[PDB]
């Protein structure tokens, strides 16, 4: 109950939001139901439109007019928009030439250039430029400012998880918002669109902007509109906060457009009803700019042009429907749509397995339109499942594609044209991103980005300190003209033993055995040994071990490896691949050959036996003997260290990625250096495992199980160098593989590898960054290249996508 007796007299968008029991009067009222009597009346004047017109200059002030064209109005700062240019002779700010803004040009009093984030709702990125014709303020800002061909939505491309992860650079998982629609098991609660238990702050995790703004002394304009206040309110509003006294007035605002989404989903996202919200959107940054400049204010202010995701061609005929593949169709819950979600309708239904339902769901039909998966088999680069609002059945829906539960729910609950929600690496899912103003560069392109990296840079655009998330701070530096973060490289935390030869063969029993059989050669071999071809296969130095661990370095003629004592494998095995070198096989004689490490201690080695013994597990390399530089180097390949535990399903996998594809990769690229390694993330939250949380070791040993294995491809940016000579910019893919003992997950794997192993792998694409949150190591140490250009290249995600 509101005691909507009070006023809005004087309070209209009022900053800080009154105390109850009292009528609001601030920009969410509406939504609470709790506005005064009067809210309409004061605060959302319409009389005579939004644009001032001949007749109306030097007009008298009318207190009841939308915006004013009186002399006062600018002093007031509540003139329409356009009113210095229909009564002073001045031009709309979209026909001026841009002059680059090398410092802010800001009245007296600020202390700081304001940020101005003006987010559009399902702006996909190809409408920069298929929609430019009609869009010429946002192009102006587009071509002037700092611009990125398109920036990477965060999964589920849906609005409330990508709203609030630019508000605060975290993942869905981290903050909470995990979709659009969720229930919490533990609150025993739903959150929807609809509704008001989306308003419980229970829900929303982490720090967004404006609160990380109020604690550093920063204010902000609250960033929510209710969907009645209209577009041209919004602008007014925000122009006359910029106008409050210096100690009143906010230094960061947000305008929100429901639109281009709104008729993306009736019409499509290329609809022939899309050129006029587009053209709407254009004429509102226009009015915002137009009002900048009356303030002077225009080179003051720095822009944020962003969306929260794309849009899809989406209709009712594509969609698959659940009961077509489950006899027990209502035993579930399904959250429906661009994703699927699975829980059991009741908790007291002990007949409810997870293992059937994925069964049942997994490659029943030829052209399939969606894949199953338990939560922690999900592509490690979409980071969904460290939350209990993620339900452990996944269902990636193909884009284009709804999944539902039964026909009824779609024709009794066509219509839309559009949607979005899918995997975030898929293009039409692609959003928006331009920066304009006194703090972003001028004129000046930038590679695609993830949308987590932008509130690090608008901390850093406002001087304030980013609480902890998921960006990585200096990533984004080079969108910048000053305010740029200079992190220092994170200190190693272990440093490695560099053993000799201390064991004699005799002293290993480990069930391992090899068929293997000079003073030019043999002084040769100990230098090999001691590190000297470390240059060739180490290019970029040493990973650092940010943990607490012991662990040895082992050199090689091919490779060098740090060898986890504690693990009993390498956390990690380097070496380069030129362009001319060649493919062998393994010989007959050494299929089986397993050769005791001289430098490693027989407890701390893995054993043959316990491999023989456990009947669902296999080895593989890291270092794979196919890349052998001759064949005495070749034994190498088949020491006890280089073993690592997989199953025969993955080894197939393995086996095509090491004989194959590196090679591949070599030829295409000039030379490759590869970083391979396993990944323990057994309880699914993107972060390295300590050793109690290993939940599956080869039987009868303490050899630890990975989850995953990853590699990390490095070469030239400049491919006409090799990648062992490259002078400047790198250029690297990497991947994540999940270490599984079938391949349920490729529904063509029946096939020859060179039939589904490549798109197996595409889908797992990864950043450098992901694998260094995996493992607790830091790559690229030691490059000739700036640290922010290295955290760059981190980021950098291979999405495989054709061009936008
Ligand atoms: C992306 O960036 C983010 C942000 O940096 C990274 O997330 C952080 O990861 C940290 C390491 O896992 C984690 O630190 C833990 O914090 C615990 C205290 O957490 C509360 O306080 C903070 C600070 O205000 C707050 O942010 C947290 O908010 C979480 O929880 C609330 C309520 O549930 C949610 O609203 C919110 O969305 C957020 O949820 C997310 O994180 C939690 C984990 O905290 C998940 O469970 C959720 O699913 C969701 O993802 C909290 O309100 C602290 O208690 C932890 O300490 C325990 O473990 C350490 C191990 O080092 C040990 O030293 C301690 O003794 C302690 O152990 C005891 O508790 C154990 C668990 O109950 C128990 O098993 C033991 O036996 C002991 O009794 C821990 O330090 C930090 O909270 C999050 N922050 C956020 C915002 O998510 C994230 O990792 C990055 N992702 C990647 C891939 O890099
Ligand atoms: O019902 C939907 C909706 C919309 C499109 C849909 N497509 N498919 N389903 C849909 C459902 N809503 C309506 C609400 C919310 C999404 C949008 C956020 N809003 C801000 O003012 C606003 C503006 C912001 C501007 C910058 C940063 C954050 C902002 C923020 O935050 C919302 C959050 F905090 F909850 F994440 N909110 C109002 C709009
Ligand atoms: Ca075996
Ligand atoms: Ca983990
Ligand atoms: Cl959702
Ligand atoms: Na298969
Ligand atoms: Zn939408």
Redesign the pocket.
């Given at each position: 109950w509101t005691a909507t007796s009070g006023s809005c007299k004087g309070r209209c968008f009022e900053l800080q939001e009154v105390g109850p029991p009292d009528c609001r009067c601030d920009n969410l009222c509406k939504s609470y139901s709790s506005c005064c009597h009067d809210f309409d009346e004061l605060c959302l004047k319409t009389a005579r439109g939004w644009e001032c017109t001949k007749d109306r200059c030097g007009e008298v002030r009318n207190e009841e007019n939308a915006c004013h064209c009186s002399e006062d109005c600018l002093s007031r700062g509540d003139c329409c928009t356009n009113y210095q240019v229909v009564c002073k002779g001045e031009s709309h700010w979209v026909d001026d030439d841009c002059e680059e803004i090398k410092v802010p040009e800001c009245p007296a009093g600020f202390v700081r250039p304001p940020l101005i984030i003006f987010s559009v709702d399902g702006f996909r990125a190809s409408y920069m430029k298929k929609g430019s014709k009609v869009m010429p303020n946002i192009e102006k800002l587009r071509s002037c400012g700092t611009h990125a061909p398109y920036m990477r939505p965060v999964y589920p491309t849906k609005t409330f998880p990508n709203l609030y992860t630019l508000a605060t650079?975290?993942?869905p998982?981290?903050?909470?918002i995990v979709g659009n629609s969720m229930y919490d098991p533990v609150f025993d609660a739903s959150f929807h669109l609809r509704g008001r238990e989306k308003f419980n702050h229970?829900?929303?995790?982490?720090?967004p902007l404006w609160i990380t703004a109020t604690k550093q002394g920063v204010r902000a304009g609250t960033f929510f509109w209710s969907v009645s206040i209209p577009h041209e309110r919004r602008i007014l509003t925000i122009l006359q906060w910029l106008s409050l006294p210096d100690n009143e007035r906010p230094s960061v605002y947000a305008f929100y457009s429901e639109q281009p989404d709104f008729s993306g989903h009736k019409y499509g996202p290329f609809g022939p009803e899309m050129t006029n919200p587009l053209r709407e959107i254009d004429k509102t940054v226009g009015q915002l700019m137009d009002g900048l400049k009356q303030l002077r204010l225009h080179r003051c202010v720095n822009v944020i042009f962003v969306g929260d995701h794309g849009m899809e061609d989406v209709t009712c005929d594509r969609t698959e429907f659940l009961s077509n593949y489950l006899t027990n169709v209502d035993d579930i819950t399904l959250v429906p749509g661009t994703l699927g979600r699975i829980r059991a309708k009741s908790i007291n239904n002990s007949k409810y397995d997870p293992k059937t339902i994925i069964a049942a769901l997994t490659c029943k039909k030829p052209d399939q339109h969606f894949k199953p998966y338990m939560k922690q088999h999900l592509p490690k680069r979409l980071?969904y499942a460290?939350?209990?609002r993620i339900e452990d059945i996944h269902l990636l829906v193909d884009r284009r594609w709804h999944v539902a539960r039964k026909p009824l729910d779609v024709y009794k609950k066509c219509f839309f044209q559009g949607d979005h929600g899918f995997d975030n690496k898929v293009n039409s899912m692609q959003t928006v991103f331009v920066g304009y103003g006194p703090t972003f560069k001028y004129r000046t392109k930038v590679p695609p980005f993830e949308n987590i990296e932008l509130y690090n840079v608008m901390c850093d655009l406002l001087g304030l300190k980013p609480?902890?998330?998921?960006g990585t701070h200096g990533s984004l530096n080079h969108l910048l003209r000053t305010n740029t973060f200079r992190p220092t490289m994170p200190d190693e935390v272990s440093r490695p033993n560099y053993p000799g030869i201390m064991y004699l063969q005799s002293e290993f029993d480990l069930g391992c055995t090899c068929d293997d059989k000079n003073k030019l050669e043999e002084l040769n071999k100990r230098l090999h040994t001691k590190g000297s071809t470390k240059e060739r296969h180490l290019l970029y130095g040493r990973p650092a071990v940010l943990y607490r661990t012991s662990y040895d370095i082992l050199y090689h003629t091919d490779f060098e490896s740090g060898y986890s004592e504690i693990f009993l494998m390498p956390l990690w095995t380097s070496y380069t691949i030129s362009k001319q070198a060649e493919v062998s096989s393994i010989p007959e004689h050494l299929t089986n050959c397993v050769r005791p490490d001289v430098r490693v201690s027989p407890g701390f080695s893995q054993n043959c036996l316990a491999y023989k013994n456990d009947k669902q597990m296999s080895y593989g390399f890291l270092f794979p003997p196919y890349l052998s530089s001759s064949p005495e180097a070749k034994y190498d390949a088949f020491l006890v260290t280089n073993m690592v535990p997989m199953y025969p399903a993955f080894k197939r996998v393995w086996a095509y990625f090491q004989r194959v594809l590196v090679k591949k990769y070599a030829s295409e690229r000039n030379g490759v250096n590869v970083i391979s390694g396993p990944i323990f993330d057994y309880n699914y939250?993107?972060?390295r495992d300590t050793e109690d949380e290993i939940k599956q070791y080869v039987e009868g040993s303490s050899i630890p199980v990975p989850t995953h294995y990853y590699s990390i491809i490095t070469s030239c940016l400049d491919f006409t160098q090799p990648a062992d000579k490259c002078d400047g910019p790198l250029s690297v893919s990497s991947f994540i593989l999940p270490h599984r003992p079938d391949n349920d997950e490729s529904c063509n794997s029946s096939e020859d590898e060179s039939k589904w192993v490549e798109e197996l792998m595409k889908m797992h694409t990864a950043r450098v960054r992901?694998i260094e949150?995996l493992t607790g190591l830091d790559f690229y140490r030691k490059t000739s290249r700036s640290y922010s250009e290295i955290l760059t290249l981190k980021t950098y995600l291979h999405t495989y996508e054709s061009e936008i």
């Open positions: 650079g975290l993942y998982e981290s903050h909470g229970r829900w929303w995790g982490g720090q980071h460290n939350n209990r609480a902890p998330n998921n939250d993107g972060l992901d949150h």
